[PDB]
Amino acid sequence: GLVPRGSHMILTLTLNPSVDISYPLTALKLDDVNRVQEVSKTAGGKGLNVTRVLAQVGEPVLASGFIGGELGQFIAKKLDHADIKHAFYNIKGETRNCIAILHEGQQTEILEQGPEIDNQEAAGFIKHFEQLLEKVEAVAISGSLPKGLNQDYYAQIIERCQNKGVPVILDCSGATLQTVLENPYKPTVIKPNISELYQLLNQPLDESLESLKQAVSQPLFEGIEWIIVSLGAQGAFAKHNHTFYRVNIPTISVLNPVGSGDSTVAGITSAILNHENDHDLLKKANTLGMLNAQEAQTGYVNLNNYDDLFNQIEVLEV
């Protein structure tokens, strides 16, 4: 089989990756020495969890964003080992660490701000991104902006995509998302869960179908092709153009839900790339999300459990 020369590929963006350090502890002794033998150190960031799920699904994918220093080199080594292709922009600063302490039933995290991106690097990445766009049919953007970047930076990136007709799946939240929602350059897919959605509008939460319909049809969400809203265990609600869907998912036994959002993003972006119909797009997004939740690993899916759950998902035009 020949190595492809065209544009049939996903680009993931992880603008603030980290070297995640995991410390499983039987107890965290505060104000003392905690000795540990089994530390796991990985290439972290939501965009990289998306990339990993896409590689499992078998989709062509290229990871980019900003890396720097020895820790950026460590990130690169890790992706190389996993046979994951990447084209990160090198910066003068150093990629961050993030700590997760797994102890006594608890995840105690320490999250580093990370490097400052200067002006030449911010501009140069845009030129880099533009080059990468020539060989790409979809772009998945995950996580918040590193320090030093203009708060319109995703809007700039989305604008480059829209000109070339390359669809954007945006997974970011808070002010970051809101900044994009208020700008003229629209992502193709956004995916806030039900509380996030109403918070964005500054309205009380309401699970009623009619109320979710009005919420997603509001001015804030104008021009976004897909809005895909998680209602939790009771599946999802989605709006495609002006068509509404209730996605009904089966009861599952979950273990670790972190990275289900990342897995959903991989499923959406895979379905986009492939031009899957609405039902298929929705079923894939929710299956990957559910499979990951069933795993102890973050941004990992067991593909031999995919088809049985997929067959249990029901999509209704509502």
Place this chain on the structure above:
Amino acid sequence: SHMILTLTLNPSVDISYPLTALKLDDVNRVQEVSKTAGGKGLNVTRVLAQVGEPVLASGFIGGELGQFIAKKLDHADIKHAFYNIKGETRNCIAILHEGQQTEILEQGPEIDNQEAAGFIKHFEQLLEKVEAVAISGSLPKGLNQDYYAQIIERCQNKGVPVILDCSGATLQTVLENPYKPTVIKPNISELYQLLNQPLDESLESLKQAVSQPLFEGIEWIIVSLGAQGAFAKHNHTFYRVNIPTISVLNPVGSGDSTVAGITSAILNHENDHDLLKKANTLGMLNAQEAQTGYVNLNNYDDLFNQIEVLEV
């Protein structure tokens, strides 16, 4: 060859997280993070570089975190000649939160037999360009227990003095072997732990303890007594070090500074009074500092002059 070799067989990339509160089971966001080349022998090195002493750092490093260490040393203009390994140099974490130091220490990499013998050959060639060796810390995972004895054998052959700063079962393996460090520095509690003897602060018990067959063939034995000062044995002579008063802000790495002081004195063939004061002045200087393995040498002279040394 007028140079000190420091040995840091198990260094770390130390990460330091100063927090207002450590919120457990929650996200703690941090902005001001300090990442440094860590390990006792590197503290010795930094203190020796402060004093202006010719120094070269060696030991094992691996992967990207090993390169971070080299880079940090390069920036500090500290010379190094490490031996690279297939494993990764470890991280060590310190969370400083509401008066507490909560530490996470990784075991670190395993060293294989080719790497262990590789370092021995590398160390022997380094030994041709140095006049004193300071050894700090314990053995990384995978190394034969005899490894320090092997290193010291090489130094003894070459007539190069070894200042040994290591503890517990690690030090005990050395004491029982034929090839001797020139200087050891166990504290008083540690001294009696070695003999499996009850802790006695008595001077005669101390003279006896330091003269027991476990410590035979060791030139300098320097025992910290706390604020009191020190008790030391040089060949057959016994000294007592009378040290002034200071406020201790951070007493971590005070031993490192004392090793740097003992080792500098050995390099420059200083007399016995001058060595004990210098060992003690650097140790106190560091105890006054917030920075681990750091001394303010402005206060050196006055603190040095307030030190008396008595043969007892």
